[PDB]
Amino acid sequence: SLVPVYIYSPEYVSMCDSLAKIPKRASMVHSLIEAYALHKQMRIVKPKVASMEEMATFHTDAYLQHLQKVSQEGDDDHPDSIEYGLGYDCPATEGIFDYAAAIGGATITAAQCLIDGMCKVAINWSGGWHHAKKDEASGFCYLNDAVLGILRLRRKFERILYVDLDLHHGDGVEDAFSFTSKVMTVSLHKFSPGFFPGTGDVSDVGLGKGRYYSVNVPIQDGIQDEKYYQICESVLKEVYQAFNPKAVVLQLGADTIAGDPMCSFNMTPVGIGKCLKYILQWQLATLILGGGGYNLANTARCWTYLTGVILGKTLSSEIPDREFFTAYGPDYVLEITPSCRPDRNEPHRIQQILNYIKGNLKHVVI
Ligand SMILES: CN(C)c1ccc(C(=O)NCCCCCCC(=O)NO)cc1
Ligand SMILES: [K+]
Ligand SMILES: [K+]
Ligand SMILES: [Zn+2]
Q1: Of the ligands numbered here, which is closest to the C-alpha atom of 190?
Q2: Looking at residue 120, what DSSP letter applies?
Q3: Transmembrane helix as a keyword?
Q4: Checking DSSP bridges between strand 121-124 and strand 247-251, what pairing results, if any?
Q5: Alpha carbon nearest to ligand 1 atom 17, residue
Q6: How many helices (H) and strands (E) does the chain have?
Q7: Nearest residue (CA) to ligand 1, atom 9
Q8: Helical segments of 37-187, H only
Q9: Strand pairing report for 43-45 and 247-251
Q10: Rounded CA gap, 302 and 256, in Å?
Q11: 240 a known binding residue?
């Protein structure tokens, strides 16, 4: 068990390609990975589809059955749907229940691989839908696969660390485990008035027995690789020493990358890659997930690069993908150049945030 598990099948990718907000992204991601032949260095595992019972380990039957109902024909005019979070952000597209069950099952399959000791790293680039609530779709997320995966991992591993490097706050995962000390959630994210989903200030630390077992790092526009890694490393260092996790779930949404229409952070995959490396050197069972990422070519660039990092491989700069070659224009290279725009993060504020978190984590004692 030294070779990473790569969750993939043509049917799975085809289903993931059907998501309204990210059409064909799953195909572009796999295609680039395939073109670099990285899948040949991984153990390819076909994802099982999640059963109703498996999904009900987190979601309520009422939500699941409603989702299943409107999905059968794609009824986007059902009275109850709005209260279930279906609407503009999360349309009731036809087959959405099967799509959600596939993504959920994929993450669960990855978790099962980790449990069975088939690998130390399992990857589901089409997972990471961190906004989904117990009975509410949210932020393009219909099912919280990350939560399902964490719950599966808990069958074998005592403490789970969830690290969320998406541009957005991993609120759905944080909320799901807000009450417990057995799962710690760490989220680095943009935090600004009005910016979705609005939660996750540094003062948000969890509830009850879960107090101080939620960690949030509010960040402003324009952050680049060096500063981001400095922040991420300091937080993760403190978290690791205090929490001593037995397994890790890592969400690597590429909407932080320069050129993403979200136009907030100014990162390159190299910076995120450094964070990933730091986590990998803990040598723990690690479940790798995707997430946001709306510059499709750049998202493919990012996750392909990260797959290379996981494999310890250095990748050729020239894009080898023929099928989607034109999408990588005009320069057709793997590297991504940061935009020209200011880092809005004041060093004093960042330091305040870091100090606050360090104070919070002192309460965390295993
Ligand atoms: C240009 N256009 C049609 C839109 C632009 C922005 C949104 C939006 O922010 N919606 C709120 C939901 C955002 C979910 C973000 C998901 C994510 O990346 N999570 O990590 C909607 C439409
Ligand atoms: K995040
Ligand atoms: K927690
Ligand atoms: Zn996001």
Answers
A1: 2
A2: S
A3: no
A4: unpaired
A5: 292
A6: 11, 8
A7: 196
A8: 52-55, 61-71, 96-115, 145-153, 171-176
A9: unpaired
A10: 10
A11: no
Catalytic residue IDs: 131
Ligand 2 (ion): residues with CB under 5 Å are 164, 166, 187, 189
Determine the distance separating the centroid of ligand 2 and the alpha carbon of 170, expressed in angstroms: 5
Judge whether 164 and 185 are in contact, CB under 8 Å.
yes
Domain extent listing, the chain: 1-366
Distance 165 CA to ligand 2 centre (A): 4
Q: What is the resolution of this structure in A?
A: 2.0
Residue 121's φ and ψ, nearest 5 degrees, are: -130, 125
CATH fold, domain 1-366, is Arginase; Chain A (3.40.800)
- Burial bucket for residue 261 (CB in 10 Å: 0-12, 13-18, 19+): exposed
Nearest ligand to the CA of 165 is 2
Neighbour count for residue 359 (Cβ, 10 Å): 10
| Pairwise CA distance, residues 272 & 274, whole Å | 5
* Atom 12 of ligand 1, nearest CA residue: 139
Beta bridge partners of 195: none
- The secondary structure element, H or E, covering residue 163 is strand 160-164
Count the Cβ atoms, other than its own, within 10 Å of residue 77. 7
